[PDB]
């Protein structure tokens, strides 16, 4: 309704569940990893002035990061105070390691050391005040292997805020803005059913049209639904994209 005064949802997302299921065709270590759902968006005009190395906190109701995924928290000095707060909040099983910024800069200097730290956790969360430093220190070994630290605001440093922020951080999808006209957003996996997947799509679309696309949903060229190896089924096409680009330019 917001995008084009129409809602061609539900039917396409539900059909995609059967489309990937039909395309199904001893090991010791097993995991519940599922193929992600890639929501492709095309915009009429470029949406990024420059490479922004922070994710978008797209709040969602169906988390794309399972609660079994380990988390690593990066805080400002000293690390002992925030280590005590994490333990007192009951996040020991979630926030496994808390690394102070000075310790992260010093004790992890080699590329192999940075890669070992990167592979030791599934998601990285960072204090909002220390996020601008992580472009350095962490380097290309983090920002290209799908490991972008999350800007979690823990400024006041209290247990309830930590629990709310982590739950909010886990229950959200992220997308790193890049200068282009096309991008993909993680909407979920096959584990999430059709109705939950549809809810994730519309919530992301509202967030995208609000704080990502400068002119809103009117500037959306086309949108498609895709998986790792599935066909990019066209979710929706702008009925007036061709004339809008001609008139704008």
């Amino acid at each position: 309704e917001l995008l084009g005064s129409d809602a061609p949802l539900e039917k396409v997302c539900s059909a995609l569940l059967e489309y990937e299921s039909k395309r199904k065709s001893l090991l010791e270590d097993e995991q519940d990893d599922i193929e992600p759902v890639w929501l492709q968006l095309a915009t009429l005009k470029f949406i990024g002035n420059n490479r922004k190395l922070i994710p978008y906190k797209i709040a969602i109701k169906n988390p794309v990061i399972p609660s079994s995924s380990e988390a690593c928290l990066i805080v400002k000095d000293p690390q002992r105070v925030y280590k005590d707060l994490v333990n007192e909040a009951g996040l020991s099983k979630v926030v496994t390691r808390v690394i102070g910024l000075s310790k992260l800069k010093a004790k992890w200097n080699s590329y192999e050391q940075k890669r070992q730290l990167r592979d030791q956790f599934d998601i990285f969360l960072a204090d909002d005040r220390v996020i601008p430093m992580l472009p350095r220190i962490l380097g290309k070994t983090f920002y290209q292997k799908s490991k972008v630290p999350v800007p979690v605001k823990i400024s006041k440093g209290t247990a309830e805020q930590l629990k709310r922020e982590v739950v909010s951080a886990y229950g959200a999808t992220y997308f790193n803005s890049a200068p282009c006209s096309s991008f993909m957003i993680k909407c979920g996996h096959v584990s999430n059913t059709s109705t939950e997947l549809a809810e994730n799509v519309e919530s992301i679309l509202q967030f995208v049209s609000k704080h990502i696309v400068p002119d809103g949903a009117k500037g959306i060229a086309s949108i498609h639904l895709k998986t790792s190896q599935s066909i990019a089924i066209p979710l929706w096409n702008n009925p007036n994209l061709k004339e809008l680009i001609a008139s704008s330019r």
Partner: protein
Amino acid sequence: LKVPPAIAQFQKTLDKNTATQVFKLLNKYRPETAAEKKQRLVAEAEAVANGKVSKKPYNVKYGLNHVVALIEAKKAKLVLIASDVDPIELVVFLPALCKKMGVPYAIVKNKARLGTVIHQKTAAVLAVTEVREEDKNELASIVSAVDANFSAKYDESRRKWGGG
């Protein structure tokens, strides 16, 4: 004159560049002076006299008996032998003991330079046993340099009688 290979090896010392980089790491781990040790202890004394739990210290290991015991225990990561010990037989076995124990070792110049690191007039041998996590890469790069600039170099030269 003609010198045996075990004494001839001390004329082939570490190069100036690698030695200068070695002492940059060593100077981070100097033992605290007699004055600095007294200041730290008296500071804890006042905290006891009036009314009131640390980490393990970090420093470079020195002393001939101490270092040889650390090599035999395989506790030493890098052993730096003075090139001009007045009785040479004091350190004439150290390159062989370091080879047997797999300890990266180098023969550096000016035993006085070694003593300056430890606030002493003179040191026959210095040994780095275990450093802070910040300097793991710096020590690792030095050990690789000592392998190439001292062990890969010479080596075939250290088995030949020098002089003559």
